Amino acid sequence: KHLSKKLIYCAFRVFDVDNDGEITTAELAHILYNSITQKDVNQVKKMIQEVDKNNDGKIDFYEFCEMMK
Amino acid sequence: DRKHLSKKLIYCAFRVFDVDNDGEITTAELAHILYNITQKDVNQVKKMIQEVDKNNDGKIDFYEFCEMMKLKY
Numbered sequence: 001k002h003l004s005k006k007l008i009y010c011a012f013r014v015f016d017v018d019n020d021g022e023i024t025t026a027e028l029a030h031i032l033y034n035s036i037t038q039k040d041v042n043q044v045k046k047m048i049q050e051v052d053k054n055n056d057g058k059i060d061f062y063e064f065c066e067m068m069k
Numbered sequence: 070d071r072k073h074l075s076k077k078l079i080y081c082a083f084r085v086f087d088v089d090n091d092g093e094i095t096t097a098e099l100a101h102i103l104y105n106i107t108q109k110d111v112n113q114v115k116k117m118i119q120e121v122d123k124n125n126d127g128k129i130d131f132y133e134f135c136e137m138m139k140l141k142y
């Protein structure tokens with residue numbers, strides 16, 4: 001389990017582009033779609049809402065783990 | 070639907086770890102992601118890969134990466 005934990009940490013760090021400890025809509029859209037559309041942004045917003053435990057519109061590491069485990 | 074999203078993020082995570090896009094994470098790629106290596110570090114990585122290598126080739130493919138992310142039923 002430790003190794004999957006370590007890789008979950010690394011994955012978050014790489015998605016958290018600006019290193020503030022939160023994945024935003026803009027960061028998540030960028031990872032999901034490497035010049036993308038409003039429709040895509042709204043779909044990302046809805047995804048975040050399914051796992052956003054503190055309702056701030058972002059995904060922190062705890063929320064990322066909860067979603068992964 | 071939240072299963073679907075975790076699945077999408079597991080795909081994206083793999084892709085980013087698989088630096089050269091050949092569909093396999095190798096010792097060198099995993100070491101690179103784990104360490105911002107000495108021989109000791111390389112061997113530590115090789116041991117981690119062993120724990121989850123299912124086809125005994127010393128690399129982690131997406132299927133193995135996914136399996137590792139979930140419980141053994």
Ligand SMILES: [Ca+2]
Pocket residue numbers: 016017018019020021022023024027
């Ligand atoms: Ca961030």
Ligand SMILES: [Ca+2]
Pocket residue numbers: 052053054055056057058059060063
């Ligand atoms: Ca949040």
Ligand SMILES: [Ca+2]
Pocket residue numbers: 087088089090091092093094095098
């Ligand atoms: Ca590779």
Ligand SMILES: [Ca+2]
Pocket residue numbers: 122123124125126127128129130133
């Ligand atoms: Ca393998």
